[PDB]
Amino acid sequence: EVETFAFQAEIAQLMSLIINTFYSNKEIFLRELISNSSDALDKIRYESLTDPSKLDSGKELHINLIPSKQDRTLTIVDTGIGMTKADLINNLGTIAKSGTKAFMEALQAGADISMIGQFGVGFYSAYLVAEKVTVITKHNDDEQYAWESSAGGSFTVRTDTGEPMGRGTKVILHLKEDQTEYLEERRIKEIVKKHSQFIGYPITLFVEK
Numbered sequence: 704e705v706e707t708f709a710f711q712a713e714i715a716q717l718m719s720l721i722i723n724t725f726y727s728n729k730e731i732f733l734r735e736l737i738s739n740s741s742d743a744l745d746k747i748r749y750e751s752l753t754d755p756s757k758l759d760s761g762k763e764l765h766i767n768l769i770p771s772k773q774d775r776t777l778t779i780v781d782t783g784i785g786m787t788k789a790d791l792i793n794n795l796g797t798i799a800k801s802g803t804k805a806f807m808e809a810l811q812a813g814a815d816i817s818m819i820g821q822f823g824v825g826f827y828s829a830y831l832v833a834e835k836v837t838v839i840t841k842h843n844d845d846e847q848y849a850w851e852s853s854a855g856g857s858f859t860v861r862t863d864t865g866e867p868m869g870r871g872t873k874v875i876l877h878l879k880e881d882q883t884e885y886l887e888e889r890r891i892k893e894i895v896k897k898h899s900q901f902i903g904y905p906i907t908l909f910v911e912k
């Protein structure tokens with residue numbers, strides 16, 4: 704079964720702003736997703752210090768960047784703590800409502816879209832470059848889920864039938880047709896070096912076959 708949900712009005716407004724505002728500096732999406740992965744890796748590492756069994760689903764703590772020219776996707780994979788069903792449907796959106804309102808006000812007060820991560824809603828910068836985002840995620844003691852949205856005010860959640868991940872999150876960016884530069888090894892290297900060079904987990908940039 705696929706369940707369809709309405710975004711909170713403030714998050715739908717944020718997504719429309721990101722999709723519709725003219726802003727050439729689109730590359731900031733990657734730093735935001737890598738930062739989210741780093742935060743999730745921090746969380747499972749910290750929890751493992753008092754409950755080592757939390758790493759039974761995988762001890763490797765890393766970030767993979769995987770381009771696919773054939774699928775026109777850029778995938779950001781981490782082995783962090785992952786998200787529960789309640790995270791996906793309700794609880795992360797509840798936290799994001801406050802940051803969205805703060806971001807939207809700062810925007811009017813002269814802030815830049817690149818400051819989005821300071822408001823805890825950096826994920827939605829993915830819609831600078833993606834027409835659709837699919838998020839596959841697995842938290843210990845919950846099932847593997849697929850979250851998906853092409854914006855337009857709704858998202859879906861379903862139990863994922865694909866390959867099991869163990870633990871963590873995969874953000875699959877279905878790139879807009881004019882945003883395929885973010886499949887180039889060279890371009891991704893440039894962005895990671897510029898924005899993400901001090902992240903405390905190995906970032907592997909996969910090469911296309």
Ligand SMILES: CC(C)(C)C1=NO[C@@H](Cn2cnc3c(Cl)nc(N)nc32)C1
Pocket residue numbers: 739740743781783784785786790791792795796826838850872
């Ligand atoms: C609900 C949805 C749109 C999918 C997000 N809201 O929060 C986002 C940022 N975020 C929160 N928890 C995260 C974990 Cl555990 N990992 C990673 N990579 N990102 C995480 C994602």
